[PDB]
């Protein structure tokens, strides 16, 4: 093939131009995101049954929905939780690779057949099925510095006009609101109800009857009489619009004749739909707007368009209403992409510099500066073809493959120049023969590197999607690099090259070093046998370092924002949790003035379950330019915040940093489900969980920080209605229950229309009449006659413990356990210990692994089998290249040499064994194997064609291969040196990649140049 | 043709007729299933001790091992050879007539006294200033 | 009586059902056992 | 193009003064001047 | 039924159209609200 | 129609580029495709 | 699949005849089909 393109430079140039155009078009038409889809598809069913506890919600909604969740394809598992706020949260997790649209529509159609079984209130509120995606892009915030309008007024303003305009931005159309629009609130008053002999049932009936749309037909409608000439629609009574119109609603007429309206009996206002969540922003009211990202959309373009749209909407804003951005990492993605592109361009520049330093030929130095970008653009085109996107993983795979691209582009030109020098030939003949010497070696290298990189895109589970990005990126880059080095680089060498005081000294010292190296290699071929023992020591040390290095998933890095979770004890109110959320934001805006830019404090929306004793304040820091030093990073700020929050003891405040992927984390951690499968009950399962927790606490050597992911039982106010006593007094059960629920839990009766937008109408007791158990004495229910029997007459009160959050796994009651393996031991034997402990539980209590422990359990053994297949295929490719069964062993013995350096670099800098380190290790061993392939191919070619002796051939081979190895190693080390020394602005990934790659490359370059010759000699002499 | 699009189209058209069906049909549950006509397999359950009757075995199967099987991938339909437990109320015409009662009275009383009612909360939002305790209120539960 | 969904595989579905039953078995009451009075998959396996 | 429309204003208090409910008022207004689909029947074996 | 175009638009058309966003390969969307109460929304997607 | 009018110049440019590249690749010269692309306006004016 | 010699006839009530006329027609067709044993074997109605 290279001979074909040497004679036809124009064809090679045309192919290169085609590749570059395809790559440019792909770059112009590739979606950009921080990370691709990693978590398996999940579909979430959310239901609201206001006024109900965990058990009522469970029994009436959750079980009914779960028993009808059958016949859905590719379902991995399902888990539901029912909260004491009246919320059903059912998450169904599917197999990876199944399109979530068909899964969501299947879940919807399967649920829509269970709607008639749900309570009327649950149906009326609505049940929402939606995909649980990680497309979370930005959090817009609308605050009111002017202090006039409340949080409800801001929420309604956001929902009325901003939401629709934002949802039509170029990009996403899916948005969420951190609040609720207006709702016509009717706050009753028990005293007026008792005075007028009225009940909340009467108010509900009056509101329903006197606010509704009724059809009325039309006049002149078909069939008409003969001679009809007029046809007009008829408009009957319409829905109410104003608060005063609801005020005029007549409840009853009095015996004497006076009129009773709602205003006389209740207070009518434009309140919120719910008051469970109070959002704040630096101590002042605010309303948020969560913005996702559409599939196949550019995150940067979407964020820019949304910001432009908000700026365009800004002029027609009322007083105040500044647009803030409490959570947005668009600039993080842009900074990371810019750093990656800077790394690539600096690598190209360093290749230019190194090539001119070793080869004093300006024309030759440039053959690789116009060939590597071609491979990069081809890689972009292939990524576009395979349906991938521009994310952190793909660009880091590209910066890892850049070293091998450089390796190829340098090897070809270096050997061409060496042939021109030694042989003294014109460029065309020299490059013709040069390609002949390295053309079979370049095809074997491609096969070997494909065999070592492809069998990691087939890892199962969530992490397999992470590995697939690197696998496909690097394999496409290598295939394209080999194609380019076979097509375009020979043509450039044939055409551009011209036949042939610090640089003189550099040449002299390099020649002296080459002579010394050749003498050393000749010497170590006579003392062979000690170096085999040294290699065995190296292998043992590599094994020790690999089994010593801790593991992880991805480096958590300073994104500029972090969270703080506040968890007051059970039974705490909203104002009690608001005080702590004020102690937290005051601390952040006082003790961290130079680092904290804003704090968004959501009250009632906790981390382990929404309520009133929970809250989360997420903090947006200033730009990384404004936070110099290691003490101004998120890691050094969260620890200080937690230390300062240890003092407050009435609550449990904990500041932490977001994970790299919100859907993953805690690679050493495990998730455990304790299920009851005999109908034991909630309390027996709680006792089993307590026993298992005690047993786990009795094993501090293996399991660390095992805790139940749930809420313990809390006191509850039980009202027991005597049926015989109620029937004796002539009061109906459906009236007692209705008045109790409407007064204390609220009741959504119907809808009204204001400002051209349908809104809800809620009836509830005024706050002061529903706060204490004794307030029950304020409420009277009308008997069969005009009496007003007190609640106290027919009911009794009690305090008893009940669960505020009941969770089920796969349709059965369950308890969740979060655990972590010991630092010195992996997470595989921790799962075994948890199984062994769970095996000693009361009869009827089983267990299960969920979340990421579910994936580990079934898809945690793919790696050894895939690597064995890779090694077998590498053997086959190398034996095919060398036409021998023993020679490939010499090539394969360069693997520990590259592994040990990466392991040493990881240990020295305190890094862990994450995905970046593993991919860098694979890159290092691939490059070292490629160098070994070239050396052994040259040596055996000298043996075969020229009939040289073994020592002479293996000495000349390293003599003429020394320069390219040093050139490529120096270029790659200088290219990734800034990655090692980099702090802030997404430096965790950069360090995790660069440290391992640099250490492995340095050690492999130092060791291979001495071990490949002795390996080849030992293989040739021991065999044959 | 793929059965996914066929099933979603059939359900889309069936949701139009759903409001027109009697309330009893909707309460029982209308199901749309894509499966074969013949049984893939039959898994029987027996009791060797001879204590459980046909009713007990069928109830156990339906309650504890039918839902999980129905959610197994590839299982398009499950037919239970029996029926799970339910509160059977065998009402006597003679004793109903003796007390001047009717089946509608029995149904009304059961609906009234076998409810799972939402009673609200103590100190629920919006709370009055100075509230200290927050507790759920539980009024009535399903009979068991 | 289990009928497989259209387009599914009849052998891996049977394997999954048997796995579910195996998980179910340890929590059965005393004396309750599972029999297989009808199965079209073993014929397929023996024929292949 | 825009069309004239006939609007009926019903006084709730004046209705309840005379003893007529608003529900049957709406029913008799809708059923008289507009169609009122009551239920089904069988014509020639078909539900109409 | 029973609602004119104005009282059906902001009731159903405006609240359905606002949620008709985020669907990929959508060219445009039109709608119409009759005085009979019927509402028709047409979403036209990209060709192919 | 507006979409088709907005993409004709791009279609012509891409077609010309592809033909030029194919001719240069096949005939192993840059002068031959450049001389061939000079006759295109004659055919274009004929069609016009 | 059935047998190679099997067929599944399906008599339709195209008009509004009813159940009695349809079953009379089915009985007449069955009686006529029973008169050709040399060609039709075991012609039976599937329903009750
Ligand atoms: C895969 C594409 C690259 C493969 C290397 C090039 C190659 O196979 O081409 C020549 C073999 O004959 C060929 O020409 C094989 C077909 C190569 C073109 C594939 C398109 C080698 O070159 P050579 O024939 O000069 O050397 C013969 C040395 N034993
Ligand atoms: C051989 C076939 O050509 C070849 O080996 C190469 C022919 C062109 C195929 C490569 C085209 C690349 C297209 C995709 C790139 C992106 C020609 O040479 P020969 O066998 O007659 O021997 C003479 C060589 N010294
Ligand atoms: C793209 C891959 C092909 C290699 C790179 C170009 C060199 C082509 C030479 C080989 C010939 C075979 C390939 C055919 C040419 C494909 C390029 C045109 C594709 C195309 O219509 O994209 C237009 C690019 O034009 C603008 O640049 C504006 C934008 O047009 P569009 O946006 O309508 O196409 C969106 C489709 N849905
Ligand atoms: C010259 C440039 C050549 C480009 C080479 C790139 C090859 C990368 C593809 C590697 C690969 O097999 O990954 C597939 C990516 O899927 C998407 O195709 C896996 O595909 P998969 O997950 O469907 O395979 C398993 C189901 N049996
Ligand atoms: C996909 C297949 C692409 C072709 C791969 C190698 C084809 C051999 C011909 C070739 O490329 O030219 C030789 C280089 O061979 C080499 O460099 C081949 C050595 C690498 C071995 C890879 C394993 C074999 C791939 C096929 C496995 C079967 C799967 C079916 C495609 C010229 O030089 P030469 O003839 O002196 O080289 C001794 C090899 N015998
Ligand atoms: C760019 C996108 C469009 C594609 C354009 C394809 C261009 C085709 C290549 C033309 C070069 C000539 C050629 O094929 O080489 C031959 C050499 O034969 C050989 O020794 C066999 C060479 C194998 C040719 C493979 C053709 C496909 C290229 C990939 C004939 O050479 P010649 O033109 O001198 O005629 C012989 C008169 N002495
Ligand atoms: C000249 C030897 C070619 C054998 C391989 C045929 C497939 C490559 C097509 C490109 C032109 C030969
Ligand atoms: C047939 C040769 C195609 C070359 C362009 C890539
Ligand atoms: C614009 C994206 C590239 C178009 C050419 C197809 C590349 C196929 C790679 C396999
Ligand atoms: C730029 C996206 C194109 C991908 C498909 C290539 C064929
Ligand atoms: C989805 C599987 C894709 C793998 C395709 C392999 C073909 C690569 C050919 C590259 C040769 C230059």
Q: What is the DSSP string of chain C?
A: -EEEBTT--HHHHHHHHHHHHHHHGGG--TTEEEEEEEESHHHHHHH-
Tokens read off for F44: 């274009």
Q: Of the candidates A955, A1011, A40, A930, which has an alpha carbon nearest to the alpha carbon of residue A447?
A: A930
- B with F: touching (≥3 Cβ pairs within 8 Å): no
Tokens read off for A742: 């409407």
| Dihedral pair phi/psi, residue A677, rounded to 5° | -130, 30
Q: Of the candidates A612, A591, A596, which has an alpha carbon nearest to the alpha carbon of residue A562?
A: A596
CA distance A135 to A229: 59
The answer to whether the CB atoms of B119 and A51 lie below 8 A apart is yes
Q: Cα distance from F18 to chain A (closest Cα, Å)?
A: 9
First to last CA, chain F: 20
Closest approach atom of ligand 2 to CA A1: 5
- A with C: touching (≥3 Cβ pairs within 8 Å): yes
Q: Of the candidates A556, A506, A535, which has an alpha carbon nearest to the alpha carbon of residue A657?
A: A556
CA distance A26 to A47: 43
Residue pair A924/A997 in contact (Cβ under 8 Å)? The answer is yes
What is the whole-number distance in angstroms between the Cα of residue A900 and the centre of ligand 11? 32
Q: Cα distance from D47 to chain A (closest Cα, Å)?
A: 23
CA distance A921 to A901: 9
What is the whole-number distance in angstroms between the Cα of residue A22 and the centre of ligand 7? 25
The answer to whether the CB atoms of A71 and C5 lie below 8 A apart is yes
Please give the DSSP secondary-structure letter assigned to residue B99. Answer: T
| Dihedral pair phi/psi, residue A978, rounded to 5° | -60, -25
C27 class by beta-carbon count within 10 Å (0-12 exposed, 13-18 middle, 19+ buried): middle
Please give the DSSP secondary-structure letter assigned to residue G35. Answer: T
Give the rounded distance of the alpha carbon of E3 from its chain centre: 16
Mark A84-116 as b/e (b = at least 16 C-beta within 10 Å). Answer: bbbbbbbebbbebeeebebbbbbbbbbbbbbbb
Residue pair A388/A36 in contact (Cβ under 8 Å)? The answer is yes
Regarding the beta carbon of A443 and ligand 5, being less than 6 Å apart is answered yes
CA distance B71 to F16: 58
Sheet holding A218-219, edge to edge: A218-219, A232-235, D5-7
What is the whole-number distance in angstroms between the Cα of residue A7 and the centre of ligand 1? 15
A536 class by beta-carbon count within 10 Å (0-12 exposed, 13-18 middle, 19+ buried): exposed
CA distance A289 to A302: 15
Experimental method: cryo-EM
Mark A321-357 as b/e (b = at least 16 C-beta within 10 Å). Answer: bebbbbbbbbebbebbbebbeebbeebbebbbebbeb
Site to substitute for ligand 9 among A381, A475, A483, most atoms within 8 A of C-beta:
A381
The answer to whether the CB atoms of A846 and C27 lie below 8 A apart is yes
Q: Of the candidates A461, A490, A549, which has an alpha carbon nearest to the alpha carbon of residue A903?
A: A549
Mark A174-211 as b/e (b = at least 16 C-beta within 10 Å). Answer: bbebbbbbbbbbbbbbbeebbebebbbbbbbebbeebb
Please give the DSSP secondary-structure letter assigned to residue A359. Answer: S
CA distance B136 to A510: 83
What is the whole-number distance in angstroms between the Cα of residue A523 and the centre of ligand 4? 47
Mark A960-992 as b/e (b = at least 16 C-beta within 10 Å). Answer: bbbbbbbbbbbbbbbbbeebbebebbbbbbbbb
Residue pair A555/A992 in contact (Cβ under 8 Å)? The answer is yes
Q: Of the candidates A163, A154, A148, A175, which has an alpha carbon nearest to the alpha carbon of residue A277?
A: A154
**Beta strand segments in chain F, E:** none
CA distance A582 to A421: 77
Q: Where are the alpha helices (DSSP H) in A54-161?
A: 54-57, 63-67, 100-111, 120-125, 151-157
Other CB atoms within 10 A of residue A772 CB: 17
Residue A649 sits in the same domain as residue A720: no
Q: Of the candidates E16, C44, B17, B125, which has an alpha carbon nearest to the alpha carbon of residue A273?
A: B125
Q: Of the candidates A844, D43, A181, which has an alpha carbon nearest to the alpha carbon of residue C30?
A: A844
Residue A567 sits in the same domain as residue A651: yes
Q: What is chain C's alpha carbon radius of gyration, rounded to the nearest angstrom?
A: 13
Q: Cα distance from A63 to chain C (closest Cα, Å)?
A: 20
CA distance A787 to C14: 66
Which chain C residue has the Cα nearest residue A71?
Answer: C5
- Following CA atoms A597, A599, A600, A606 in sequence, which dihedral angle do they give, to the nearest 10 degrees? 140
Which chain E residue has the Cα nearest residue A232?
Answer: E35
Q: Cα distance from E32 to chain D (closest Cα, Å)?
A: 14
Tokens read off for A749: 């009766």
Tokens read off for A575: 């104002």
CA distance A235 to A559: 58
Parallel, antiparallel, or unpaired: how do β-strands A42-48 and A87-94 relate?
Answer: antiparallel
Mark A895-922 as b/e (b = at least 16 C-beta within 10 Å). Answer: bbbbbbbbbbbbeeeebbbbbbbbbbbb
Residue pair A122/A48 in contact (Cβ under 8 Å)? The answer is yes
The answer to whether the CB atoms of D34 and A219 lie below 8 A apart is no
Residue pair A620/A326 in contact (Cβ under 8 Å)? The answer is yes
- Following CA atoms A788, A791, A793, A798 in sequence, which dihedral angle do they give, to the nearest 10 degrees? 180
Parallel, antiparallel, or unpaired: how do β-strands B135-140 and A714-721 relate?
Answer: parallel
Mark A603-628 as b/e (b = at least 16 C-beta within 10 Å). Answer: bbbbeebbbbbbbbbbbbbeebeebe
3-state secondary structure of A11: helix
Residue pair A912/A551 in contact (Cβ under 8 Å)? The answer is yes
Residue pair A831/A853 in contact (Cβ under 8 Å)? The answer is yes
List for chain G the helix, strand, coil content (%; round to 5).
Answer: 30, 0, 70
The answer to whether the CB atoms of B75 and C37 lie below 8 A apart is no
Other CB atoms within 10 A of residue A707 CB: 12
Q: Cα distance from G16 to chain D (closest Cα, Å)?
A: 5
Structural domain containing residue A653: 561-657
CA distance A580 to A3: 77
- Per the rule left: phi > 0, alpha: psi between -120 and 50, beta: everything else, A987 is alpha
On chain A, the residues whose CB falls within 8 A of the CB of D37 are none
- Per the rule left: phi > 0, alpha: psi between -120 and 50, beta: everything else, B82 is left
Q: How far is CA A222 from CA A231, A236, D39, D48, in A?
A: 9, 19, 21, 20
Helices A502-524 and A987-1022: crossing angle in degrees, nearest 10, is 50
3-state secondary structure of A826: coil
| Dihedral pair phi/psi, residue A847, rounded to 5° | -140, 170
Other CB atoms within 10 A of residue A694 CB: 10
Cβ-nearest to D5 among E1, E2, E4: E4
The answer to whether the CB atoms of E21 and A216 lie below 8 A apart is no
User: For chain G, which chains pass the contact test of at least 3 CB pairs under 8 Å?
Assistant: D
| Dihedral pair phi/psi, residue D15, rounded to 5° | -70, -50
Please give the DSSP secondary-structure letter assigned to residue B63. Answer: I
Residue pair A291/A141 in contact (Cβ under 8 Å)? The answer is no
Tokens read off for A489: 């680089």
Residue A200 sits in the same domain as residue A266: yes
The sign of the torsion formed by the CA atoms of A96, A97, A101, A102 equals negative
Q: Long-range contacts for A243-249 (Cβ within 8 Å, ≥24 apart)?
A: A243/A184, A243/A268, A243/A269, A243/A270, A246/A184, A246/A186, A246/A207, A246/A211, A246/A752, A246/A761, A249/A206, A249/A207, A249/A210, A249/A211
Question: What residues pair up with A818 in beta bridges, in sequence order?
Answer: A671, A707
CA distance A376 to A392: 16
| Dihedral pair phi/psi, residue F27, rounded to 5° | -95, 5
Q: Of the candidates A887, A901, A683, which has an alpha carbon nearest to the alpha carbon of residue A800?
A: A683
Question: What residues pair up with D5 in beta bridges, in sequence order?
Answer: A233
Q: Of the candidates A1000, A989, A1009, which has an alpha carbon nearest to the alpha carbon of residue A336?
A: A989
Contacts of A825 (CB under 8 A, 6+ apart): A702
Residue pair A371/A380 in contact (Cβ under 8 Å)? The answer is no
Tokens read off for A187: 């706050």
The answer to whether the CB atoms of A844 and C26 lie below 8 A apart is no
The answer to whether the CB atoms of A237 and D4 lie below 8 A apart is no
Angle among Cα A207, A213, A219 to the nearest 5 degrees reads: 145
Which chain D residue has the Cα nearest residue E5?
Answer: D2
Q: How far is CA A201 from CA A196, A720, D12, F30, in A?
A: 13, 21, 19, 90
Residue A568 sits in the same domain as residue A648: yes
Residue A566 sits in the same domain as residue A653: yes
Tokens 């229309």 -> residue:
A753
**Beta strand segments in chain B, E:** 41-47, 75-78, 117-122, 135-140
3-state secondary structure of A19: helix
Regarding the beta carbon of F25 and ligand 6, being less than 6 Å apart is answered yes
Residue pair A708/B111 in contact (Cβ under 8 Å)? The answer is no
Q: How far is CA A603 from CA A155, A179, A580, A818, B63, in A?
A: 15, 12, 10, 25, 41
Which chain D residue has the Cα nearest residue G20?
Answer: D45
Regarding the beta carbon of A476 and ligand 4, being less than 6 Å apart is answered yes
Tokens read off for A821: 């393996």
Other CB atoms within 10 A of residue C48 CB: 6
3-state secondary structure of A193: helix
What is the whole-number distance in angstroms between the Cα of residue A1 and the centre of ligand 2? 4
Please give the DSSP secondary-structure letter assigned to residue E9. Answer: I
Whether cis (ω within 30° of 0) applies to the bond prior to A374 is no
The answer to whether the CB atoms of A163 and E10 lie below 8 A apart is no
3-state secondary structure of B46: strand
Regarding the beta carbon of A873 and ligand 3, being less than 6 Å apart is answered no
Whether cis (ω within 30° of 0) applies to the bond prior to A197 is no
CA distance A699 to A834: 10
DSSP per-residue string spanning A243-266: HHHHHT-EEEE-SSS-EEEHHHHE
What is the whole-number distance in angstroms between the Cα of residue A182 and the centre of ligand 4? 52
Residue pair F28/A11 in contact (Cβ under 8 Å)? The answer is yes
Closest approach atom of ligand 6 to CA F21: 1
Regarding the beta carbon of A524 and ligand 3, being less than 6 Å apart is answered no
Question: What residues pair up with B44 in beta bridges, in sequence order?
Answer: C35
Cβ-nearest to A678 among C5, C23, C27: C27
CA distance D31 to D38: 10
Tokens 């996702």 -> residue:
A292
What is the whole-number distance in angstroms between the Cα of residue A771 and the centre of ligand 6? 90
G41 class by beta-carbon count within 10 Å (0-12 exposed, 13-18 middle, 19+ buried): exposed
Residue pair A493/A370 in contact (Cβ under 8 Å)? The answer is no
Angle among Cα A169, A170, A171 to the nearest 5 degrees reads: 95
List for chain F the helix, strand, coil content (%; round to 5).
Answer: 85, 0, 15
The sign of the torsion formed by the CA atoms of A447, A453, A454, A455 equals positive
Q: What is chain E's alpha carbon radius of gyration, rounded to the nearest angstrom?
A: 12
Tokens 């051939």 -> residue:
A953
Residue pair A518/A485 in contact (Cβ under 8 Å)? The answer is no
**Any idea what the CATH number is for the domain that residue A254 is in?**
3.30.2090.10
A741 class by beta-carbon count within 10 Å (0-12 exposed, 13-18 middle, 19+ buried): buried
On chain D, the residues whose CB falls within 8 A of the CB of G16 are 43-46
**Residues of G at the D interface (Cβ-Cβ below 8 Å)?**
13, 16, 18
Helices A427-453 and A862-882: crossing angle in degrees, nearest 10, is 150
Contacts of A149 (CB under 8 A, 6+ apart): A157, A285, A318, A320
Residue pair A77/A809 in contact (Cβ under 8 Å)? The answer is yes
Parallel, antiparallel, or unpaired: how do β-strands A747-753 and A805-809 relate?
Answer: unpaired
**Beta strand segments in B49-128, E:** 75-78, 117-122
Q: Cα distance from D45 to chain A (closest Cα, Å)?
A: 27
Q: Biggest alpha carbon distance in chain E?
A: 40
Please give the DSSP secondary-structure letter assigned to residue B50. Answer: S
Helices A372-385 and A461-496: crossing angle in degrees, nearest 10, is 140
């Amino acid at each position: 093939m290279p001979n074909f393109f040497i004679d036809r430079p124009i064809f090679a140039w045309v192919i290169a131009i085609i590749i570059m155009l395809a790559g440019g078009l792909a770059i112009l038409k590739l979606p950009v995101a921080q990370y691709p889809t990693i978590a398996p598809p999940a579909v979430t069913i959310s239901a609201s049954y206001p006024g109900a506890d965990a058990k009522t919600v469970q029994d009436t909604v959750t079980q009914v929905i779960e028993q009808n969740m059958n016949g859905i394809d590719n379902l991995m598992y399902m888990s539901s939780n029912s909260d004491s706020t009246g919320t059903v949260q059912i998450t169904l997790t599917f197999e990876s690779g199944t399109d979530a649209d068909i899964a969501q529509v299947q879940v919807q159609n399967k649920l829509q057949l269970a709607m008639p079984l749900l309570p009327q209130e649950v149906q009326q509120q609505g049940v929402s099925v939606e995909k649980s995606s990680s497309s979370f892009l930005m959090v817009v915030g609308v605050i009111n510095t002017d202090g006039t309008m409340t949080q409800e007024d801001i929420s309604d303003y956001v929902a009325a006009n901003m939401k629709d305009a934002i949802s039509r931005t170029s990009g996403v159309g899916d948005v969420q609101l951190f609040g609720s629009q207006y709702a016509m609130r009717i706050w009753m008053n028990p005293n007026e109800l008792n005075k007028f002999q009225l009940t909340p049932v009467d108010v509900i009936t009056a509101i329903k009857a006197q606010n509704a749309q009724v059809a009325a037909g039309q006049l002149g409608g078909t069939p008409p009489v003969k001679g009809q000439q007029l046809n007009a629609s008829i408009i009957a009574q319409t829905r109410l619009t104003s608060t005063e119109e609801f005020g005029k609603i007549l409840l009853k007429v009095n015996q004497d004749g006076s009129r009773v309206l709602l205003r006389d009996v209740a207070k009518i206002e434009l309140g919120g739909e719910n008051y469970d969540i109070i959002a704040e922003f630096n101590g002042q009211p605010a309303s948020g707007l969560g913005i996702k990202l559409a599939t196949g959309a550019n995150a940067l373009d979407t964020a820019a368009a949304i910001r432009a749209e908000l700026a365009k909407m800004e002029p027609f804003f009322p007083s105040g209403l500044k647009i803030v951005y409490p959570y947005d990492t668009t600039p993080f993605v842009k900074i990371s992409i810019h750093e990656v592109v800077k790394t690539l361009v600096e690598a190209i520049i360093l290749v230019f510099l190194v090539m001119y330093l070793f080869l004093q030929n300006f024309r030759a130095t440039l053959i690789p500066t116009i060939a590597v970008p071609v491979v990069l653009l081809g890689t972009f085109a292939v990524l576009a073809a395979f349906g991938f996107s521009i994310n952190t993983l793909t660009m880091f795979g590209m910066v890892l493959a850049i070293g091998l691209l450089v390796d190829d582009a340098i090897v070809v030109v270096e050997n061409v120049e060496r042939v021109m020098a030694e042989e003294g030939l014109p460029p065309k003949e020299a490059t013709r023969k040069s390609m002949g010497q390295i053309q079979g070696a370049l095809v074997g290298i491609a096969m070997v590197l494909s065999a070592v990189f492809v069998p990691m895109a087939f890892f199962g589970g969530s992490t397999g999607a992470i590995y697939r990005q690197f696998s496909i990126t690097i394999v496409s880059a290598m295939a394209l690099s080999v194609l380019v080095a076979l097509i375009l680089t020979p043509a450039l060498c044939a055409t551009m090259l011209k036949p042939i005081g610090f640089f003189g000294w550099f040449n002299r010292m390099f020649e002296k070093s080459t002579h010394h190296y050749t003498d050393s290699v000749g010497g170590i071929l006579r003392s062979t046998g000690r170096y085999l023992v040294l290699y065995l020591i190296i292998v043992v040390g590599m094994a020790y370092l690999f089994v010593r290095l801790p593991s992880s998933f991805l480096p958590d890095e300073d994104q500029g924002v972090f969270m703080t979770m506040v968890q007051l004890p059970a039974g705490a109110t909203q104002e009690r949790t608001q005080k702590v959320l004020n102690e937290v934001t005051h601390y952040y805006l006082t003790k961290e003035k130079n680092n904290v830019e804003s704090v968004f404090a959501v009250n009632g929306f906790g981390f382990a379950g929404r309520g009133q004793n929970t809250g989360i304040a997420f903090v947006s820091l200033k730009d990384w330019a404004d936070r110099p030093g290691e003490e101004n990073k998120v890691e050094a700020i969260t620890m200080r915040a937690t230390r300062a929050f240890s003092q407050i003891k009435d609550a449990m405040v904990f500041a932490f940093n977001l994970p790299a992927i919100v859907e993953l984390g805690t690679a050493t951690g495990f998730d455990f489900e304790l299920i009851d499968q005999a109908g034991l009950g909630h309390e027996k399962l709680t006792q089993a969980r307590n026993q298992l927790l005690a047993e786990a606490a009795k094993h501090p050597d293996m399991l660390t920080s095992v805790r139940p992911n749930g809420l313990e039982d809390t006191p509850q106010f039980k009202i027991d209605i005597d049926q015989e006593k109620a029937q004796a007094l002539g009061v109906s059960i459906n009236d007692i229950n209705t008045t109790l629920g409407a007064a204390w839990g609220g009741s959504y009766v119907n809808d009204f229309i204001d400002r051209g937008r349908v809104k809800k109408v809620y009836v509830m007791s005024e706050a002061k009449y529903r706060m204490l158990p004794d307030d029950i004495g304020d409420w009277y229910v009308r008997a069969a006659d005009g009496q007003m029997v007190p609640f106290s007459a027919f009911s009794s009160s009690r305090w008893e413990y009940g669960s505020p959050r009941l969770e089920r796994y796969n349709g059965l009651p369950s308890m969740e356990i979060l655990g972590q393996a010991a630092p010195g031991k992996s997470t595989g034997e921790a799962m075994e210990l948890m199984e062994q402990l769970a095996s000693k539980l009361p009869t009827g209590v089983g267990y299960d692994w969920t979340g990421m422990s579910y994936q580990e359990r079934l898809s945690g053994n793919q790696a050894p089998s895939l690597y064995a297949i890779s090694l077998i295929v590498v053997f086959l490719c190398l034996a095919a290249l060398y036409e021998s069964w023993s020679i490939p062993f010499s090539v394969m013995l360069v693997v520990p040499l590259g592994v040990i350096g990466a392991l040493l670099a990881a240990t020295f800098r305190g890094l862990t064994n994450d995905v970046y380190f593993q991919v860098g290790l694979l890159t290092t061993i691939g490059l070292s194997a490629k160098n070994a392939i070239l050396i052994v191919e040259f040596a055996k070619d000298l043996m075969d064609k020229e009939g040289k002796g073994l020592i002479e051939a293996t000495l000349d081979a390293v003599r003429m291969r020394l320069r390219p190895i040093l050139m490529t190693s120096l270029a790659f080390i200088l290219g990734v040196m800034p990655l090692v020394i980099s702090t802030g602005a997404g430096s965790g990934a950069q360090n995790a990649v660069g440290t391992g790659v640099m250490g492995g490359m340095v050690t492999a370059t130092v060791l291979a140049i001495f071990f490949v010759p002795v390996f080849f000699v030992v293989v040739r002499r021991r065999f044959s």
